[PDB]
Symmetry: D2
Subunit: 363 residues, 4 copies
């Protein structure tokens, strides 16, 4: 039966948002089966802001290339593949796409140590505009996260190391509708904040019970160590992509996580790499750097403008969003030596999630 999952990740460069050359070659060479693709996680060149059309262009170009390789119309990929493009690739970040596959096999290969990577996906019930940034969004995301854990065959939340949530944002047209029906409305960071909390609820990090509309954009004590949330568009359907480990994984990869303690801290990144399975003290050898397949780091602006006792400009800077990612990228790439890293963030808030996927090889 569809019994053991085998997830893989292939990281391929993009020279522009619409450069799918090396992405298409992955399928055309028979290296990867397009039907087994479950997620595309990408960095694009551009502003990274709410109206970054270059980000949308990469999304459209990647969907089109994948649909062509699968031989379907693009309109099919819509529920079957998570496509997550984070805009803004400053400094050392090389734009790319991480192609995530998963197949299920009937038998577990021999000699795979410890736990291994597994992917789960889930979808929310429709989130109405009067739900956005409020307790209904939290509950609905939490259910989709529970569903993604179930899809991955994972029951222990401690084995979940990264949860990507894509939700809807408000538009004047959605407001128009709540308004029609007699409803008030709250928008991107509300949605993002509600989603992260949903993750926390579903992973048992925050009791439910503690949730209410008035805690949502406020009580920083309530948090998920592993949520990475974004919003936009109008799709009332929330989407969850969940990366975990399981003892029964056939995958040749393992995931781990850490928490970036402040804006100059490398210990979160290192912890991610270490708990994913690389045994190292302070720095990675070249061989160990190459064990690291991908890093997914979310570099939200810090909660204060005080860093190691000193004033910094990171909250005042008009280019703050761009700088946060520039810094996060420099930190990750200085450790791993790999410019094609998933560095997202730059939203307003001091700890940030980072996850690392590393090779897990048979004995």
């Amino acid at each position: 039966s569809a019994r053991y999952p085998k997830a893989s990740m292939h990281v391929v460069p993009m020279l522009a948002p619409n450069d799918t050359a090396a992405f298409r070659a992955l399928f055309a060479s028979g290296a990867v089966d397009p039907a087994s693709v479950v997620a595309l996680i990408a960095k694009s060149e551009g502003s990274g802001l709410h109206n970054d059309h270059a980000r949308v262009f990469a999304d459209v170009s990647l969907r089109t290339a994948l649909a062509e390789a699968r031989g379907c119309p693009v309109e099919d990929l819509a529920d079957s593949v998570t496509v997550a493009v984070s805009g803004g690739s400053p400094g050392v970040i090389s734009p790319h796409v991480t192609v995530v596959t998963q197949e299920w096999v009937a038998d577990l290969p021999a000699g795979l140590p410890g736990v291994g990577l597994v992917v789960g996906r889930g979808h929310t019930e429709p989130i109405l505009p009067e739900d956005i940034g409020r307790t209904a969004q939290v509950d609905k995301v939490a259910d989709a996260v529970a569903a993604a854990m179930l899809d991955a065959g994972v029951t222990d939340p401690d084995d979940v190391h990264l949860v990507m949530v894509k939700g809807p944002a408000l538009s004047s047209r959605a407001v128009a509708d709540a308004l029609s029906r007699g409803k008030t409305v709250v928008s991107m960071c509300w949605s993002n904040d509600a989603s992260a909390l949903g993750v926390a609820v579903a992973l048992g990090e925050v009791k439910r019970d503690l949730v209410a509309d008035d805690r949502i954009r406020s009580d920083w004590d309530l948090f998920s160590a592993v949520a990475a949330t974004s919003s936009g568009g109008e799709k009332r359907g929330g989407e969850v992509l969940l990366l975990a480990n399981s003892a029964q994984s056939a995958s040749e990869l393992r995931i781990g996580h850490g928490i970036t303690r402040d804006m100059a801290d490398t210990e979160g990144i290192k912890t991610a790499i270490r708990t994913a399975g690389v045994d190292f003290d302070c720095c990675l050898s070249p061989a160990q750097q190459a064990q690291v397949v991908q890093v997914f780091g979310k570099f939200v602006l810090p909660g204060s403008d005080v860093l190691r006792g000193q004033h910094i400009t990171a909250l005042d800077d008009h280019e703050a969003h761009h700088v946060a990612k520039a810094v996060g990228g420099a930190l990750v790439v200085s450790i791993t030596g790999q410019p094609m890293s998933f560095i997202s963030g730059g939203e307003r808030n001091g700890g940030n999630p980072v996850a690392a996927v590393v090779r897990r090889l048979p004995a």
Copy 2:
């Protein structure tokens, strides 16, 4: 007579916040008459028209003149004031106050070599000289003079050379036209000529190799330009066996945009014994880092395409990245991170970085 150089790093919350700078003198901690340089990072764009940078300069000069009890004018040959604009990300704006006194006695038990400061001034650099061989020669002479002022003869003991030169203005280019002369094209012509001057003076580049057509390396030049002052200025940081200073300087070369080995080499050759990472005690031995993060020579990094040369905010991002690398090693946000110019100092895609670290008696 023995030089004793010191450095005091103090924070600035804005370009005109000289509170903690003035306290240094008012507390008797530091003698304002011994100040030979102010090296500062200000908040702002870091571009050619960054008025916040000029504001810090003016505020720092005014505060120093007041502490010395002189008018601000009387300070203009005697102190190098170098403000680099643009303090993205982890860079905390600040001023490094550099002092030097000469003492009659060399304290006992100071290991190896020690920090020494030298300063120099060029003969006037005409607008037809900018970016051309004349600027090179004139900077080289000012660097030689700064070595002589520091009592240093060995160029291998020079670890950082800051040059401030003039840039073209429309009125300068009017003047050269007046006298029947062409101008070169501009801040970066000046900067490139200056770096080469440093190289010539340190024996890094033979002079016969210089001509206007080569002008677009020194491992240790950190050059900038602007204004109209025809007088070039040189600030030189070195070591000497006869230094009374409780500090030592070292340098390295940043190999590419993600490399930390240049920074680490700077710290290590300055005197900190470490393998890969610094302990907290060792991080606190590092008093200041002076890193220049010019954009790289190509858009290929570890075999992959990067956006750093195409980005409209490239100048700001270069410093953001450089700052992140330095501060991730030293834990000290008040670091001197300059740069963001387009890519003649350092090897190709290579950037200079210097570190000043404690040198304590036995």
Copy 3:
């Protein structure tokens, strides 16, 4: 006694270029002791942390103090210094030097009404006051005081009210927390504009409450131009009006910019100030216009003449708004040294309408 107000517009090549400013006094053209306001545009970002703006402020204060022969600290209550940062496109950085003296006799043959300046200061505005009803009341009182200082009783004769107020800092929040209080820039600005509206009888005071402050666009002042920052708990009001007993050789007028491409507000300002023209100004008429003070806040919607615009989404929206406002004003007056402020998000004029005021020559 009869007020005599004047305005002299001088260029600045940088935020610390006070050359042409100092020449005004050194040439005997203007008496520095009679300066009551400096209204300036500086080069820079125009954002909350625009240090180039502060640099112009400090430079202008220092030059003025030196010309007066006082320490710079004396000019703190006696002169309004208002520097708006951000001079995109056709806007030439400059300082408008506003003077006022009072004379014992009213010259003959001055037509209609004439310019008068008034100033006021608020009682201290605590951080728990910012963006709330207390700020409104305190600004309103300072506006009433400025009218009284100008000798003006009719709000219809008031054509421009500049308010500078405090903004929140973490350190102010800390204080209000310390005393068991909550807190809440645009809040401050919105509360100030409403204060102006209250004091000019444009909005009845019963309509005011903390919940309306930033939400009910129906409450607005046609002539408020508000800003905030720093920590100075003292609000400041500079008020430009006319009066039948003015000895000034200038008159002020105002208009409302109807949308982002509209020139009729600017033209109405110029026309009601006294220039008689149908659609476009001759060169002689353009030179009658001494200064324009236009506030170009972002619009309330992204729909302009039935089409979508990017002005609310643009990361550079603040800068673009001023670029556009400046282009409109300068295309009419031909004078790049115009006071174009704004770029805040959209209580100041009607839905998305923007105030503009014009000062023009009024000759015997």
Copy 4:
């Protein structure tokens, strides 16, 4: 045979919003086979790496090809697609759809002259040709060809010439080893072909330094690697069946509205200083190029427009505010922001297309 050119201006809410564009064809209002140019403004930076601009190009081509029922590859010589990125302030992103049919009969009562469109292609422009005399010559030949395509012999009847050329990449340089230069060379090519600049005056040395050599009507851009230069030319002709006429003017400085007004006036609107609402609606489109000025002195005063880091964006913001303040129409083609051979020192070209109705 008589040309009948038309223009339909439709909004875009995003670079990939082709909804109103597709409705034009689906409603039978416009025949997609008659489309000869798409001239568009997109939201984005307007800089060399503006991918949003490329996105609009791709989206528009794909929509048009779908409406024609061909593969997108077949539009590649038959339709000029020109997207200028950067839509600050009052500029509403949109596409001007330009059609042209040739008809057997010339309608009665069409006053004066009327709009006609011509197109041309250069021979391949090698990278060693870019910014040099070869690019000039090759562009000039393509402009002569576009005139011939439009049936126009009098350069005075040409009011707008858009040239798209290649820019350099490290990979093109590599080959020759075996942007503004390109734009400058192209403008000069236009000038040569329209008789505005004698060809003996051209040399690699004058290109981008002798400002005395200029075209009043060139609007040039570059990018990509396509060695093929493209020319789109808008003119009038006495034998036009078109219900439109084009005119042009020169913007004298950054705050000047007289160039815009001259464009509208010479295109056929009779007005003194300001347009009535009826007259504003006669103006179908304006194509204005707002290159940064040659100096930082404006009406005797210093401006920041050359020093500003956002200069390119601001120039268009200003140009757009001027155009829209006259016409009341946010969907206007405002390009530019390059550093300052499109027009006199300090001067910028602007063209206007206005209604020309039967008697």
